[PDB]
Amino acid sequence: WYRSNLTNYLESNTSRHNSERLRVDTSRLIQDKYQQTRKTQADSTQNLG
Amino acid sequence: DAYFQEDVPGSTEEHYRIRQVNIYYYLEDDSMSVIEPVVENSGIPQGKLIKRQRLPKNDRGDHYHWKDLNRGINITIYGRTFRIVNCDKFTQVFLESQGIELNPPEKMALDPYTELRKQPLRKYVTPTDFDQLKQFLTFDKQVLRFYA
Amino acid sequence: MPKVLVENAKNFPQCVLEISDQEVLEWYTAKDFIVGKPLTMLGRTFFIYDCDPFTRQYYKEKFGISDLPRI
Amino acid sequence: ASRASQHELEKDLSDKQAAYRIDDKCHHLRNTSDGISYFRGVERVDATV
Amino acid sequence: KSQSDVNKKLEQRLEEVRFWKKELDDKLEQLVSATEDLLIYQTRLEKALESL
Amino acid sequence: LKVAQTRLDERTRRPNIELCRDMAQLRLVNEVYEVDDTIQTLQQRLRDA
Amino acid sequence: AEQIRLNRSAKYSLEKDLRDKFTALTIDDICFSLNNNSPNIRYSENAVRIEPNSVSLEDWLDFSSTNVEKADRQRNNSMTLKALVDRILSQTASDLQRQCDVVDT
Numbered sequence: 004w005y006r007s008n009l010t011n012y013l014e015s016n017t018s019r020h021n022s023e024r025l026r027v028d029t030s031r032l033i034q035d036k037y038q039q040t041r042k043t044q045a046d047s048t049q050n051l052g
Numbered sequence: 053d054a055y056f057q058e059d060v061p062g063s064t065e066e067h068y069r070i071r072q073v074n075i076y077y078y079l080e081d082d083s084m085s086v087i088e089p090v091v092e093n094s095g096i097p098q099g100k101l102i103k104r105q106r107l108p109k110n111d112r113g114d115h116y117h118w119k120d121l122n123r124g125i126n127i128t129i130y131g132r133t134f135r136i137v138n139c140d141k142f143t144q145v146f147l148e149s150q151g152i153e154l155n156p157p158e159k160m161a162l163d164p165y166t167e168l169r170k171q172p173l174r175k176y177v178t179p180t181d182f183d184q185l186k187q188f189l190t191f192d193k194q195v196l197r198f199y200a
Numbered sequence: 201m202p203k204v205l206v207e208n209a210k211n212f213p214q215c216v217l218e219i220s221d222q223e224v225l226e227w228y229t230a231k232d233f234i235v236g237k238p239l240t241m242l243g244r245t246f247f248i249y250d251c252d253p254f255t256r257q258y259y260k261e262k263f264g265i266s267d268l269p270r271i
Numbered sequence: 272a273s274r275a276s277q278h279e280l281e282k283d284l285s286d287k288q289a290a291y292r293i294d295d296k297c298h299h300l301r302n303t304s305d306g307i308s309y310f311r312g313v314e315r316v317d318a319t320v
Numbered sequence: 321k322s323q324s325d326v327n328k329k330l331e332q333r334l335e336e337v338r339f340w341k342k343e344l345d346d347k348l349e350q351l352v353s354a355t356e357d358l359l360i361y362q363t364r365l366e367k368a369l370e371s372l
Numbered sequence: 373l374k375v376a377q378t379r380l381d382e383r384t385r386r387p388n389i390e391l392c393r394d395m396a397q398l399r400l401v402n403e404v405y406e407v408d409d410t411i412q413t414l415q416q417r418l419r420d421a
Numbered sequence: 422a423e424q425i426r427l428n429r430s431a432k433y434s435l436e437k438d439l440r441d442k443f444t445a446l447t448i449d450d451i452c453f454s455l456n457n458n459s460p461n462i463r464y465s466e467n468a469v470r471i472e473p474n475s476v477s478l479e480d481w482l483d484f485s486s487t488n489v490e491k492a493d494r495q496r497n498n499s500m501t502l503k504a505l506v507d508r509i510l511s512q513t514a515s516d517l518q519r520q521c522d523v524v525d526t
Contacts, residue, residue: 022421025417025420025421026421029417029420029421032413032414032417036410036413036414039406039410040406040407040410043402043403043406043407044375044376044403046399047376047379047396047399047400047402047403048298050394050395050396050399050400051294051297051298051379051396051400052298119423119426148433149430149433149434150426150430151425151426151427151428151429151430151431151432151433152426152429153429194254196230196233196251196254196255196258197251197252197254197255198233198235198248198250198251198255199235199248199249199250199251200239200246200247200248200249278460281459281460285460286387286388286389286390287390288454289386289387289390290386290390292447292450293382293383293385293386293390294383294386294396296382296443297379297382297383297396300375300378300379300382301345301349301375302352302374302375303348303349303351303352303353304345304348304375304439305436305439305440305443306378306440307374307375307378308374308377308378308381309373309374309377310377310378310380310381311377313376313377313380313381313384313400313401313404314380314401314404314405316384317397317401318384318391319391319392319393319397320388320389320391320392323457327453330449330452330453331453333449334446334449334450334453337442337445337446337449338446340442340482340485341439341442341443341446343485343489344435344438344439344442344485344488344489345439347435347489347492347493347496348432348435348436348439348492350496351428351431351432351435351492351495351496352432354428354495354496354499354500354503355425355428355429355432355499357499357503358424358425358428358499358502358503359425361503361506361507362422362425364510365506365510368510368513
């Protein structure tokens with residue numbers, strides 16, 4: 004019972020943490036992609052200018 | 053233009069049925085009609101399907117407006133469920149003028165009875181020209197010698 | 201001369217009938233006799249090494265071969 | 272002779288006029304402008320003479 | 321003198337139409353931004369009904 | 373992405389000579405790819421999350 | 422959804438008027454870049470004529486101003502609905518949380 008009383012706890016910990024990492028990294032990916040895509044346009048614009 | 057699927061019972065070489073309808077929306081009195089254009093060799097009493105009157109939408113008696121009529125949608129009326137597929141340039145420009153984004157169009161479903169109700173094309177593709185006489189008149193006294 | 205035959209040679213009774221036009225999928229054509237490679241006819245291998253410049257001009261002007269070698 | 276030179280330069284100015292105009296629409300073609308459609312192949316296509 | 325006057329009148333017409341085109345474009349930017357805010361709020365409402 | 377596409381679809385209608393591999397041509401041709409790859413990274417992050 | 426529809430209708434009309442502005446601008450640029458010895462200059466026809474579909478300068482400026490003010494008014498309505506929707510969502514969340522808490526108690 005104590006072994007299966009730890010299995011569940013492990014699943015939660017791992018699963019919970021997996022999400023946090025993905026979410027944290029995802030948020031960043033967003034700011035990153037936002038910045039560059041805006042910049043890329045700025046660069047491309049100066050060339051046309 | 054729309055279609056609705058009918059499950060016909062007790063019928064040979066057919067188990068579903070697609071019938072072709074045009075759904076007209078009159079803006080003068082906010083009314084609707086459904087006309088069914090006639091295909092030639094079909095025993096269905098084809099013609100007009102729903103007369104020109106304000107088609108109810110809900111139980112409480114709301115008529116269908118043009119603010120919820122787009123391309124590629126399911127609309128139910130009097131039990132049936134029509135699948136609106138496309139529209140013309142006038143309906144397109146009116147809907148984009150009044151501020152409704154139109155869904156991407158889909159391909160119009162075809163009746164199996166109508167499409168097996170087709171005679172074959174009785175045309176033939178003529179054979180090529182390089183028969184024995186061209187092969188004798190063009191490459192005579194011409195052989196390809198090799199060393200092996 | 202026939203190359204690879206249709207997939208009905210097992211049903212085809214060649215004890216009586218010959219290898220006719222109805223059951224040959226590919227005949228041997230000038231697209232096979234390009235010098236510089238081997239070839240398997242009847243049951244033996246001929247390695248073709250040379251051809252006359254009439255064949256060389258034919259292969260220059262029809263099948264676009266411009267590297268037709270000598271071995 | 273001078274007239275042939277004039278024509279050559281005339282057509283040149285006309286070309287440069289189209290250039291400025293086309294490359295202008297581009298310089299200010301910001302998001303939420305007008306057309307901004309989703310063409311496919313603008314990168315693949317390349318025939319700069 | 322007449323051709324120079326016509327050219328000047330053309331210059332003022334170009335400046336007028338350019339100013340009004342700029343005004344229309346700057347208003348279109350904010351109109352589309354307001355539409356985008358409405359769309360994200362609509363997505364939040366759809367999440368609310370689905371979680372309900 | 374849509375902006376660059378139209379920005380490159382009109383610059384391909386420039387007449388005669390004009391059509392030149394300007395820094396823009398490169399930058400604009402790059403923009404399309406970059407933003408396409410950008411949207412792609414994001415697409416996985418959806419399936420990932 | 423109705424406010425989004427109104428915003429998109431204003432978007433359509435404003436985009437119509439904007440592309441009309443661009444094609445008038447390129448017509449007027451070609452007009453202004455016409456010198457005495459430019460090519461493609463030719464004898465015209467009837468030409469000199471007040472057009473039967475023409476409008477006045479005051480009408481043109483009134484149309485442009487009305488389009489701008491209509492778009493701005495729809496933006497004002499959009500912001501008002503934004504505040505109302507924020508209040509409605511906050512109130513709904515608070516009522517649901519408080520009712521769940523009192524049921525648990």
